[PDB]
Amino acid sequence: MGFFDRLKAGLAKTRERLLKAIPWGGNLEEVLEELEMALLAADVGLSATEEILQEVRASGRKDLKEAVKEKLVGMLEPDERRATLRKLGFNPQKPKPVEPKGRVVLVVGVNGVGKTTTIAKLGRYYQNLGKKVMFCAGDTFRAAGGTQLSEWGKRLSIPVIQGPEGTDPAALAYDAVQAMKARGYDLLFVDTAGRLHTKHNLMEELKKVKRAIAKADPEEPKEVWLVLDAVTGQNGLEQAKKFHEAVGLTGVIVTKLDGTAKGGVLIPIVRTLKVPIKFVGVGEGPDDLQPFDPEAFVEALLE
Ligand SMILES: Nc1nc2c(ncn2[C@@H]2O[C@H](COP(=O)(O)OP(=O)(O)NP(=O)(O)O)[C@@H](O)[C@H]2O)c(=O)[nH]1
């Protein structure tokens, strides 16, 4: 049964191309050559791959396989504090559940990455951790796979703040924070537009929605999570940069790991944006959106 199982399976396409075939017993030069190709071919990026090799050549004298494993895990953790408790030995089965710093999670990403679907899964997740959850449909448009955020709300018995198409989304977000406060909800997930080439500059609208939320609640939002589709790989991180510059990301959710051989992309993401990966999507099941665990992630990558 297990949980670690779904993760290993989600990384199957990624692992099976070259990683699992690396002969950790042959002489360095051969295992490193194979290593670098497998990293690059999995979208780790030349920058991180190069660093990995260097840290492994002249420093990685603990067991090549281990030196590698540990460097990769080190690269998946931005928060020194957590890497410390780890170096020490903290590592139970199920990782600590993700806790938002505040009550408002602003969700961003390009159209079609899966923000609506992810929000639905995050509602379920949090509702089982015993939290009052509310949704805000900030992308008030013809956006969805025929399933609006509104529908998912009814299904999960989560209230959805919504308005007619074209409604001012800042005003929508503002209302949602007020309704959250007034009715005492634990967490509000605010969804947003994702089209980069419409008549309203996207980054400006996101900045405007964040302003409105704080205006209604000064310290909010304490989380701004960007959703990225692993299938997009290489460029989904590029665009991610722009989002980071406009509204300050505190986190990233990567969906569809299972549909690409580019699952190594989690490395350049964390290194480039300097925020942690919060959840990873390993399938389309309700429990397929897992809380990220560097250690377990890397183990799955290499076994
Ligand atoms: N298997 C799987 N499918 C996913 C995952 N994340 C997103 N999807 C799918 O990708 C599609 C895009 O999701 P959606 O929530 O509609 O994206 P958006 O980013 O909100 N796009 P839109 O603006 O069209 O509403 C959905 O049909 C959803 O099933 C994941 O981790 N795993």
Side-chain angles (χ1 to χ4, degrees):
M1 171 267 264
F3 122 84
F4 188 54
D5 298 287
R6 292 76 61 88
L7 192 52
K8 265 193 169 186
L11 288 180
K13 281 175 181 203
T14 296
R15 180 195 325 132
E16 293 309 295
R17 294 226 297 168
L18 294 171
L19 290 161
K20 198 180 71 165
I22 295 166
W24 305 104
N27 208 178
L28 263 199
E29 316 165 306
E30 199 243 17
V31 169
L32 299 175
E33 284 196 6
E34 288 195 42
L35 205 213
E36 186 180 313
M37 291 195 251
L39 292 178
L40 290 178
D43 272 13
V44 168
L46 186 277
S47 202
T49 286
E50 270 173 351
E51 191 193 313
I52 289 169
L53 300 176
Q54 298 156 185
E55 287 190 308
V56 166
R57 288 185 187 281
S59 185
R61 209 69 59 191
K62 184 170 190 169
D63 166 75
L64 191 62
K65 200 186 209 315
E66 282 308 305
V68 165
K69 171 174 311 177
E70 209 219 307
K71 293 306 177 77
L72 291 172
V73 170
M75 290 196 124
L76 292 172
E77 187 63 16
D79 166 47
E80 179 222 355
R81 219 257 311 172
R82 279 191 191 306
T84 304
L85 279 295
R86 172 199 313 148
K87 260 192 173 77
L88 284 169
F90 172 73
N91 183 184
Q93 278 194 181
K94 316 304 174 178
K96 69 177 74 182
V98 170
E99 296 288 7
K101 170 155 172 71
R103 289 195 292 189
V104 189
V105 184
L106 178 66
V107 185
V108 308
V110 308
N111 197 245
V113 284
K115 305 185 293 316
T116 302
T117 288
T118 296
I119 295 171
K121 300 176 165 186
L122 293 162
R124 171 206 169 87
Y125 179 76
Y126 288 107
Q127 241 185 167
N128 292 326
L129 292 193
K131 284 181 165 51
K132 250 190 188 308
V133 180
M134 189 179 268
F135 289 165
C136 181
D139 185 1
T140 329
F141 301 66
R142 65 221 178 189
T147 45
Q148 304 307 317
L149 189 63
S150 169
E151 186 172 1
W152 274 116
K154 286 167 167 69
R155 289 141 86 154
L156 304 172
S157 309
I158 296 176
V160 178
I161 308 304
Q162 70 192 90
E165 182 155 298
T167 295
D168 181 2
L172 190 68
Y174 176 81
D175 301 342
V177 176
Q178 296 276 271
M180 168 197 86
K181 300 161 69 170
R183 298 159 64 177
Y185 271 68
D186 292 308
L187 294 175
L188 166 58
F189 290 82
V190 180
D191 189 21
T192 62
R195 295 192 177 292
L196 282 160
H197 312 88
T198 68
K199 55 190 169 288
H200 305 329
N201 188 84
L202 179 56
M203 299 299 114
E204 298 283 8
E205 155 176 315
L206 293 175
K207 297 172 65 54
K208 196 188 174 183
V209 172
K210 175 179 186 180
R211 232 127 57 212
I213 284 166
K215 171 175 184 183
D217 189 327
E219 306 260 306
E220 298 287 351
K222 297 280 168 50
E223 305 278 350
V224 185
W225 298 338
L226 183 142
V227 183
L228 282 198
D229 189 334
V231 162
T232 279
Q234 304 117 333
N235 188 52
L237 178 50
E238 262 298 83
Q239 184 67 54
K241 296 170 186 192
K242 282 207 175 192
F243 278 93
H244 192 38
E245 175 177 355
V247 297
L249 309 189
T250 57
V252 175
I253 292 189
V254 186
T255 62
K256 282 162 174 265
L257 278 189
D258 57 291
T260 186
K262 297 316 172 78
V265 76
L266 305 198
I267 283 85
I269 278 171
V270 173
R271 295 211 325 155
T272 287
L273 301 182
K274 298 171 181 187
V275 304
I277 299 313
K278 293 282 178 205
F279 296 78
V280 292
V282 299
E284 189 192 311
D287 302 358
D288 289 343
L289 184 71
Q290 317 186 322
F292 180 70
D293 184 70
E295 304 156 286
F297 184 80
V298 166
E299 211 71 47
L301 252 179
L302 280 49
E303 317 299 353

mmCIF file of all heavy atoms in Angstrom, residues 148-177:
data_model
loop_
_atom_site.group_PDB
_atom_site.id
_atom_site.type_symbol
_atom_site.label_atom_id
_atom_site.label_comp_id
_atom_site.label_asym_id
_atom_site.label_seq_id
_atom_site.Cartn_x
_atom_site.Cartn_y
_atom_site.Cartn_z
ATOM 1 N N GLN A 148 -16.002 24.531 -13.269
ATOM 2 C CA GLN A 148 -15.667 25.777 -12.617
ATOM 3 C C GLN A 148 -15.286 25.505 -11.140
ATOM 4 O O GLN A 148 -15.663 24.465 -10.582
ATOM 5 C CB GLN A 148 -16.889 26.720 -12.665
ATOM 6 C CG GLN A 148 -17.419 26.998 -14.036
ATOM 7 C CD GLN A 148 -16.280 27.499 -14.965
ATOM 8 O OE1 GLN A 148 -15.437 28.338 -14.560
ATOM 9 N NE2 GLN A 148 -16.265 26.995 -16.213
ATOM 10 N N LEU A 149 -14.575 26.449 -10.510
ATOM 11 C CA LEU A 149 -14.207 26.358 -9.107
ATOM 12 C C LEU A 149 -15.510 26.321 -8.300
ATOM 13 O O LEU A 149 -15.569 25.716 -7.246
ATOM 14 C CB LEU A 149 -13.456 27.591 -8.683
ATOM 15 C CG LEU A 149 -12.796 27.543 -7.264
ATOM 16 C CD1 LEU A 149 -11.733 26.492 -7.129
ATOM 17 C CD2 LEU A 149 -12.179 28.868 -6.916
ATOM 18 N N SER A 150 -16.526 27.034 -8.765
ATOM 19 C CA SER A 150 -17.846 27.093 -8.141
ATOM 20 C C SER A 150 -18.431 25.686 -7.935
ATOM 21 O O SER A 150 -18.859 25.352 -6.872
ATOM 22 C CB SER A 150 -18.777 27.913 -9.057
ATOM 23 O OG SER A 150 -20.077 27.761 -8.587
ATOM 24 N N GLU A 151 -18.438 24.875 -8.984
ATOM 25 C CA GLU A 151 -18.870 23.487 -8.907
ATOM 26 C C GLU A 151 -18.087 22.676 -7.878
ATOM 27 O O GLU A 151 -18.642 21.935 -7.050
ATOM 28 C CB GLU A 151 -18.771 22.796 -10.255
ATOM 29 C CG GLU A 151 -19.349 21.348 -10.282
ATOM 30 C CD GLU A 151 -19.431 20.679 -11.703
ATOM 31 O OE1 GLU A 151 -19.014 21.318 -12.718
ATOM 32 O OE2 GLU A 151 -19.869 19.502 -11.835
ATOM 33 N N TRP A 152 -16.781 22.781 -7.905
ATOM 34 C CA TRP A 152 -16.016 22.001 -6.961
ATOM 35 C C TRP A 152 -16.401 22.365 -5.520
ATOM 36 O O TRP A 152 -16.469 21.517 -4.696
ATOM 37 C CB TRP A 152 -14.527 22.280 -7.166
ATOM 38 C CG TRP A 152 -13.894 21.447 -8.202
ATOM 39 C CD1 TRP A 152 -13.348 21.881 -9.380
ATOM 40 C CD2 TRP A 152 -13.764 20.020 -8.187
ATOM 41 N NE1 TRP A 152 -12.844 20.805 -10.067
ATOM 42 C CE2 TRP A 152 -13.093 19.649 -9.367
ATOM 43 C CE3 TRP A 152 -14.119 19.032 -7.297
ATOM 44 C CZ2 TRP A 152 -12.790 18.349 -9.672
ATOM 45 C CZ3 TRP A 152 -13.779 17.733 -7.592
ATOM 46 C CH2 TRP A 152 -13.115 17.405 -8.763
ATOM 47 N N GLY A 153 -16.675 23.638 -5.261
ATOM 48 C CA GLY A 153 -17.102 24.122 -3.964
ATOM 49 C C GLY A 153 -18.366 23.402 -3.469
ATOM 50 O O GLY A 153 -18.438 22.939 -2.361
ATOM 51 N N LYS A 154 -19.374 23.288 -4.305
ATOM 52 C CA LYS A 154 -20.595 22.670 -3.865
ATOM 53 C C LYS A 154 -20.292 21.246 -3.510
ATOM 54 O O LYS A 154 -20.787 20.723 -2.475
ATOM 55 C CB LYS A 154 -21.645 22.697 -4.978
ATOM 56 C CG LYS A 154 -22.222 24.084 -5.170
ATOM 57 C CD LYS A 154 -23.018 24.151 -6.492
ATOM 58 C CE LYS A 154 -23.896 25.436 -6.576
ATOM 59 N NZ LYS A 154 -23.038 26.590 -6.720
ATOM 60 N N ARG A 155 -19.449 20.634 -4.345
ATOM 61 C CA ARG A 155 -19.132 19.216 -4.146
ATOM 62 C C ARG A 155 -18.416 18.987 -2.831
ATOM 63 O O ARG A 155 -18.630 17.984 -2.183
ATOM 64 C CB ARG A 155 -18.318 18.615 -5.316
ATOM 65 C CG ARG A 155 -19.155 18.449 -6.599
ATOM 66 C CD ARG A 155 -18.434 18.779 -7.895
ATOM 67 N NE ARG A 155 -17.693 17.665 -8.404
ATOM 68 C CZ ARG A 155 -17.383 17.473 -9.696
ATOM 69 N NH1 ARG A 155 -17.783 18.288 -10.673
ATOM 70 N NH2 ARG A 155 -16.702 16.390 -10.020
ATOM 71 N N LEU A 156 -17.610 19.931 -2.417
ATOM 72 C CA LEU A 156 -16.841 19.719 -1.193
ATOM 73 C C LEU A 156 -17.467 20.377 0.012
ATOM 74 O O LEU A 156 -16.917 20.313 1.107
ATOM 75 C CB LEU A 156 -15.433 20.298 -1.371
ATOM 76 C CG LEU A 156 -14.562 19.823 -2.561
ATOM 77 C CD1 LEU A 156 -13.333 20.589 -2.693
ATOM 78 C CD2 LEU A 156 -14.313 18.297 -2.502
ATOM 79 N N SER A 157 -18.597 21.058 -0.235
ATOM 80 C CA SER A 157 -19.301 21.843 0.726
ATOM 81 C C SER A 157 -18.381 22.924 1.216
ATOM 82 O O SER A 157 -18.253 23.189 2.432
ATOM 83 C CB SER A 157 -19.823 20.995 1.884
ATOM 84 O OG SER A 157 -20.556 19.848 1.441
ATOM 85 N N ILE A 158 -17.752 23.596 0.257
ATOM 86 C CA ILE A 158 -16.920 24.775 0.543
ATOM 87 C C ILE A 158 -17.541 26.024 -0.093
ATOM 88 O O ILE A 158 -17.856 26.009 -1.269
ATOM 89 C CB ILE A 158 -15.480 24.504 0.022
ATOM 90 C CG1 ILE A 158 -14.837 23.343 0.793
ATOM 91 C CG2 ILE A 158 -14.614 25.810 0.022
ATOM 92 C CD1 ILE A 158 -13.407 22.897 0.303
ATOM 93 N N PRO A 159 -17.773 27.100 0.642
ATOM 94 C CA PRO A 159 -18.422 28.284 0.034
ATOM 95 C C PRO A 159 -17.473 28.927 -0.955
ATOM 96 O O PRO A 159 -16.262 29.078 -0.708
ATOM 97 C CB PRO A 159 -18.705 29.225 1.228
ATOM 98 C CG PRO A 159 -17.628 28.818 2.260
ATOM 99 C CD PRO A 159 -17.444 27.324 2.068
ATOM 100 N N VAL A 160 -18.055 29.354 -2.084
ATOM 101 C CA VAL A 160 -17.306 29.991 -3.156
ATOM 102 C C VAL A 160 -17.724 31.447 -3.400
ATOM 103 O O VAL A 160 -18.835 31.743 -3.790
ATOM 104 C CB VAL A 160 -17.480 29.206 -4.405
ATOM 105 C CG1 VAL A 160 -16.686 29.950 -5.664
ATOM 106 C CG2 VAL A 160 -16.967 27.793 -4.183
ATOM 107 N N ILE A 161 -16.789 32.346 -3.234
ATOM 108 C CA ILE A 161 -17.094 33.743 -3.454
ATOM 109 C C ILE A 161 -16.914 33.922 -4.944
ATOM 110 O O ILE A 161 -15.853 33.675 -5.456
ATOM 111 C CB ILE A 161 -16.108 34.696 -2.643
ATOM 112 C CG1 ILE A 161 -16.065 34.295 -1.163
ATOM 113 C CG2 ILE A 161 -16.414 36.159 -2.859
ATOM 114 C CD1 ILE A 161 -17.350 34.271 -0.464
ATOM 115 N N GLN A 162 -17.965 34.396 -5.586
ATOM 116 C CA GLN A 162 -18.007 34.544 -7.007
ATOM 117 C C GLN A 162 -18.948 35.693 -7.500
ATOM 118 O O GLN A 162 -19.811 36.149 -6.806
ATOM 119 C CB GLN A 162 -18.466 33.208 -7.548
ATOM 120 C CG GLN A 162 -19.941 32.960 -7.191
ATOM 121 C CD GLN A 162 -20.358 31.541 -7.444
ATOM 122 O OE1 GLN A 162 -20.245 30.732 -6.571
ATOM 123 N NE2 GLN A 162 -20.819 31.246 -8.626
ATOM 124 N N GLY A 163 -18.783 36.124 -8.726
ATOM 125 C CA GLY A 163 -19.603 37.126 -9.327
ATOM 126 C C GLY A 163 -19.727 36.874 -10.802
ATOM 127 O O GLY A 163 -19.114 35.956 -11.316
ATOM 128 N N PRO A 164 -20.487 37.687 -11.491
ATOM 129 C CA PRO A 164 -20.725 37.501 -12.930
ATOM 130 C C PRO A 164 -19.442 37.698 -13.704
ATOM 131 O O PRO A 164 -18.578 38.336 -13.191
ATOM 132 C CB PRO A 164 -21.718 38.633 -13.251
ATOM 133 C CG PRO A 164 -22.361 38.949 -11.909
ATOM 134 C CD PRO A 164 -21.235 38.847 -10.946
ATOM 135 N N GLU A 165 -19.326 37.129 -14.878
ATOM 136 C CA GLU A 165 -18.119 37.272 -15.657
ATOM 137 C C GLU A 165 -17.715 38.722 -15.915
ATOM 138 O O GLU A 165 -18.560 39.552 -16.269
ATOM 139 C CB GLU A 165 -18.276 36.575 -17.031
ATOM 140 C CG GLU A 165 -16.978 36.696 -17.840
ATOM 141 C CD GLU A 165 -16.779 35.618 -18.867
ATOM 142 O OE1 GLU A 165 -16.694 34.436 -18.449
ATOM 143 O OE2 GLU A 165 -16.676 35.948 -20.074
ATOM 144 N N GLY A 166 -16.412 39.016 -15.745
ATOM 145 C CA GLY A 166 -15.922 40.370 -15.881
ATOM 146 C C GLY A 166 -15.964 41.169 -14.561
ATOM 147 O O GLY A 166 -15.569 42.377 -14.526
ATOM 148 N N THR A 167 -16.427 40.573 -13.472
ATOM 149 C CA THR A 167 -16.519 41.403 -12.257
ATOM 150 C C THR A 167 -15.141 41.789 -11.846
ATOM 151 O O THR A 167 -14.255 41.036 -12.052
ATOM 152 C CB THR A 167 -17.197 40.636 -11.113
ATOM 153 O OG1 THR A 167 -18.557 40.369 -11.459
ATOM 154 C CG2 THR A 167 -17.272 41.437 -9.777
ATOM 155 N N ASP A 168 -14.984 42.973 -11.263
ATOM 156 C CA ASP A 168 -13.705 43.387 -10.700
ATOM 157 C C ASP A 168 -13.219 42.395 -9.649
ATOM 158 O O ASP A 168 -13.858 42.211 -8.612
ATOM 159 C CB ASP A 168 -13.814 44.786 -10.092
ATOM 160 C CG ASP A 168 -12.503 45.271 -9.506
ATOM 161 O OD1 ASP A 168 -11.499 44.534 -9.602
ATOM 162 O OD2 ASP A 168 -12.476 46.389 -8.950
ATOM 163 N N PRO A 169 -12.085 41.757 -9.922
ATOM 164 C CA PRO A 169 -11.630 40.615 -9.122
ATOM 165 C C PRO A 169 -10.986 41.061 -7.813
ATOM 166 O O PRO A 169 -11.065 40.348 -6.814
ATOM 167 C CB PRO A 169 -10.586 39.956 -10.025
ATOM 168 C CG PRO A 169 -10.062 41.070 -10.859
ATOM 169 C CD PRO A 169 -11.226 41.989 -11.096
ATOM 170 N N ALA A 170 -10.357 42.231 -7.827
ATOM 171 C CA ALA A 170 -9.892 42.866 -6.599
ATOM 172 C C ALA A 170 -11.042 43.070 -5.617
ATOM 173 O O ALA A 170 -10.909 42.792 -4.425
ATOM 174 C CB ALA A 170 -9.215 44.191 -6.910
ATOM 175 N N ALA A 171 -12.168 43.560 -6.125
ATOM 176 C CA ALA A 171 -13.362 43.764 -5.298
ATOM 177 C C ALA A 171 -13.939 42.448 -4.865
ATOM 178 O O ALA A 171 -14.501 42.344 -3.786
ATOM 179 C CB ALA A 171 -14.384 44.537 -6.034
ATOM 180 N N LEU A 172 -13.750 41.431 -5.709
ATOM 181 C CA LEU A 172 -14.183 40.120 -5.386
ATOM 182 C C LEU A 172 -13.342 39.580 -4.235
ATOM 183 O O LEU A 172 -13.830 38.953 -3.257
ATOM 184 C CB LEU A 172 -14.064 39.272 -6.627
ATOM 185 C CG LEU A 172 -14.745 37.943 -6.413
ATOM 186 C CD1 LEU A 172 -16.274 38.207 -6.311
ATOM 187 C CD2 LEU A 172 -14.452 37.001 -7.600
ATOM 188 N N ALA A 173 -12.048 39.796 -4.370
ATOM 189 C CA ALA A 173 -11.095 39.236 -3.370
ATOM 190 C C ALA A 173 -11.323 39.917 -2.057
ATOM 191 O O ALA A 173 -11.268 39.275 -1.040
ATOM 192 C CB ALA A 173 -9.610 39.378 -3.782
ATOM 193 N N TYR A 174 -11.604 41.202 -2.141
ATOM 194 C CA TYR A 174 -11.816 42.056 -0.975
ATOM 195 C C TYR A 174 -13.018 41.512 -0.236
ATOM 196 O O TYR A 174 -12.910 41.142 0.931
ATOM 197 C CB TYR A 174 -12.064 43.526 -1.397
ATOM 198 C CG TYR A 174 -12.381 44.451 -0.213
ATOM 199 C CD1 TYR A 174 -11.377 44.952 0.550
ATOM 200 C CD2 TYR A 174 -13.655 44.774 0.124
ATOM 201 C CE1 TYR A 174 -11.616 45.800 1.646
ATOM 202 C CE2 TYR A 174 -13.933 45.561 1.241
ATOM 203 C CZ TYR A 174 -12.892 46.084 2.010
ATOM 204 O OH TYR A 174 -13.069 46.876 3.129
ATOM 205 N N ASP A 175 -14.144 41.390 -0.957
ATOM 206 C CA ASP A 175 -15.316 40.783 -0.363
ATOM 207 C C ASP A 175 -15.001 39.409 0.270
ATOM 208 O O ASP A 175 -15.542 39.097 1.315
ATOM 209 C CB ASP A 175 -16.404 40.589 -1.363
ATOM 210 C CG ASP A 175 -16.831 41.846 -1.985
ATOM 211 O OD1 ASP A 175 -16.536 42.917 -1.415
ATOM 212 O OD2 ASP A 175 -17.483 41.866 -3.059
ATOM 213 N N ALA A 176 -14.124 38.600 -0.340
ATOM 214 C CA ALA A 176 -13.906 37.260 0.178
ATOM 215 C C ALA A 176 -13.141 37.292 1.492
ATOM 216 O O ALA A 176 -13.423 36.498 2.423
ATOM 217 C CB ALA A 176 -13.133 36.348 -0.887
ATOM 218 N N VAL A 177 -12.170 38.178 1.587
ATOM 219 C CA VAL A 177 -11.481 38.274 2.822
ATOM 220 C C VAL A 177 -12.439 38.737 3.956
ATOM 221 O O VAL A 177 -12.364 38.201 5.075
ATOM 222 C CB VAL A 177 -10.281 39.161 2.714
ATOM 223 C CG1 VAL A 177 -9.564 39.356 4.173
ATOM 224 C CG2 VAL A 177 -9.382 38.611 1.711
#
